[PDB]
Nucleic acid binder design. Structure first.
Length: 49
DNA sequence: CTGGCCCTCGCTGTCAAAATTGCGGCTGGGTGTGCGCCCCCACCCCCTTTTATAGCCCCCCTTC
Protein backbone atom coordinates (compact mmCIF):
# COMPACT_ATOMS: atom_id res chain seq x y z
CA UNK A 1 0.00 0.00 0.00
CA UNK A 2 2.41 2.67 1.22
CA UNK A 3 5.68 1.24 -0.06
CA UNK A 4 7.80 3.60 -2.14
CA UNK A 5 9.43 2.64 -5.42
CA UNK A 6 12.69 1.55 -3.79
CA UNK A 7 10.80 -0.64 -1.32
CA UNK A 8 8.83 -2.13 -4.20
CA UNK A 9 12.02 -2.96 -6.10
CA UNK A 10 13.69 -4.45 -3.01
CA UNK A 11 10.59 -6.63 -2.62
CA UNK A 12 10.74 -7.92 -6.24
CA UNK A 13 7.62 -6.07 -7.39
CA UNK A 14 7.43 -3.74 -10.37
CA UNK A 15 6.82 -0.10 -9.41
CA UNK A 16 4.83 0.34 -12.61
CA UNK A 17 2.48 -2.56 -11.82
CA UNK A 18 -0.98 -0.97 -11.49
CA UNK A 19 -2.26 -3.68 -9.19
CA UNK A 20 -6.00 -4.09 -9.06
CA UNK A 21 -5.92 -7.88 -9.41
CA UNK A 22 -6.08 -10.85 -7.07
CA UNK A 23 -3.60 -13.73 -6.89
CA UNK A 24 -5.48 -17.04 -6.68
CA UNK A 25 -3.39 -20.26 -6.67
CA UNK A 26 -0.61 -18.13 -8.27
CA UNK A 27 -2.77 -16.92 -11.18
CA UNK A 28 -3.30 -13.16 -11.48
CA UNK A 29 -7.11 -13.09 -11.61
CA UNK A 30 -8.87 -9.85 -12.58
CA UNK A 31 -12.54 -9.10 -12.06
CA UNK A 32 -14.20 -7.50 -15.07
CA UNK A 33 -16.96 -5.00 -14.38
CA UNK A 34 -20.34 -6.49 -15.22
CA UNK A 35 -23.03 -4.31 -16.74
CA UNK A 36 -26.53 -4.52 -15.32
CA UNK A 37 -29.80 -2.66 -15.67
CA UNK A 38 -30.10 0.19 -13.18
CA UNK A 39 -32.02 -0.74 -10.08
CA UNK A 40 -34.83 1.15 -8.33
CA UNK A 41 -35.81 3.11 -11.47
CA UNK A 42 -39.04 2.86 -13.45
CA UNK A 43 -38.45 1.93 -17.09
CA UNK A 44 -41.09 1.81 -19.83
CA UNK A 45 -40.18 -0.33 -22.84
CA UNK A 46 -41.60 -1.14 -26.27
CA UNK A 47 -42.50 -4.84 -26.36
CA UNK A 48 -44.12 -5.15 -29.80
CA UNK A 49 -43.56 -8.94 -29.93
C1' DC B 1 -99.40 -38.35 -47.21
C1' DT B 2 -97.46 -33.52 -47.90
C1' DG B 3 -95.29 -29.00 -46.61
C1' DG B 4 -93.56 -24.73 -43.14
C1' DC B 5 -91.19 -23.74 -38.95
C1' DC B 6 -87.94 -23.84 -34.65
C1' DC B 7 -85.26 -27.14 -31.69
C1' DT B 8 -81.44 -30.14 -29.65
C1' DC B 9 -77.68 -31.64 -31.32
C1' DG B 10 -73.21 -33.28 -34.68
C1' DC B 11 -69.81 -31.69 -36.82
C1' DT B 12 -66.57 -28.29 -38.76
C1' DG B 13 -63.42 -24.23 -39.45
C1' DT B 14 -60.99 -21.15 -37.17
C1' DC B 15 -58.33 -19.05 -33.65
C1' DA B 16 -55.22 -19.68 -30.05
C1' DA B 17 -51.65 -21.44 -27.04
C1' DA B 18 -48.08 -24.78 -25.67
C1' DA B 19 -44.37 -27.22 -27.35
C1' DT B 20 -40.32 -27.85 -30.57
C1' DT B 21 -35.51 -27.56 -33.07
C1' DG B 22 -31.53 -24.78 -34.83
C1' DC B 23 -28.87 -20.75 -34.47
C1' DG B 24 -20.92 -20.09 -39.94
C1' DG B 25 -16.02 -22.29 -40.55
C1' DC B 26 -11.38 -23.35 -39.19
C1' DT B 27 -7.34 -22.31 -35.43
C1' DG B 28 -4.27 -21.37 -31.32
C1' DG B 29 -3.59 -20.57 -26.21
C1' DG B 30 -4.43 -20.99 -20.92
C1' DT B 31 -6.87 -22.65 -16.49
C1' DG B 32 -9.87 -24.96 -13.56
C1' DT B 33 -12.31 -29.28 -11.46
C1' DG B 34 -14.32 -33.66 -9.67
C1' DC B 35 -28.30 -36.97 0.93
C1' DG B 36 -30.92 -36.24 5.39
C1' DC B 37 -34.16 -37.27 9.68
C1' DC B 38 -35.28 -40.42 13.27
C1' DC B 39 -35.47 -44.83 14.82
C1' DC B 40 -33.89 -49.96 16.07
C1' DC B 41 -30.18 -53.51 16.59
C1' DA B 42 -25.27 -55.45 17.61
C1' DC B 43 -20.93 -54.57 19.65
C1' DC B 44 -17.51 -52.23 22.60
C1' DC B 45 -16.11 -48.95 26.41
C1' DC B 46 -16.42 -47.33 30.97
C1' DC B 47 -18.33 -47.60 35.42
C1' DT B 48 -15.40 -49.90 39.89
C1' DT B 49 -11.25 -51.95 42.93
C1' DT B 50 -6.10 -52.82 43.58
C1' DT B 51 -0.92 -51.13 43.42
C1' DA B 52 3.70 -49.34 41.80
C1' DT B 53 5.74 -45.33 39.08
C1' DA B 54 6.40 -39.63 37.96
C1' DG B 55 5.37 -35.27 35.43
C1' DC B 56 1.68 -32.46 35.10
C1' DC B 57 -1.96 -29.67 36.74
C1' DC B 58 -6.27 -28.14 39.60
C1' DC B 59 -7.56 -26.39 43.86
C1' DC B 60 -7.12 -24.46 48.28
C1' DC B 61 -4.28 -22.25 51.48
C1' DT B 62 -1.13 -18.81 52.91
C1' DT B 63 1.85 -14.88 52.48
C1' DC B 64 2.37 -9.86 52.11
Amino acid sequence: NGLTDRDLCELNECPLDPGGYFIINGSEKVLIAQEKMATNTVYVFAKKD
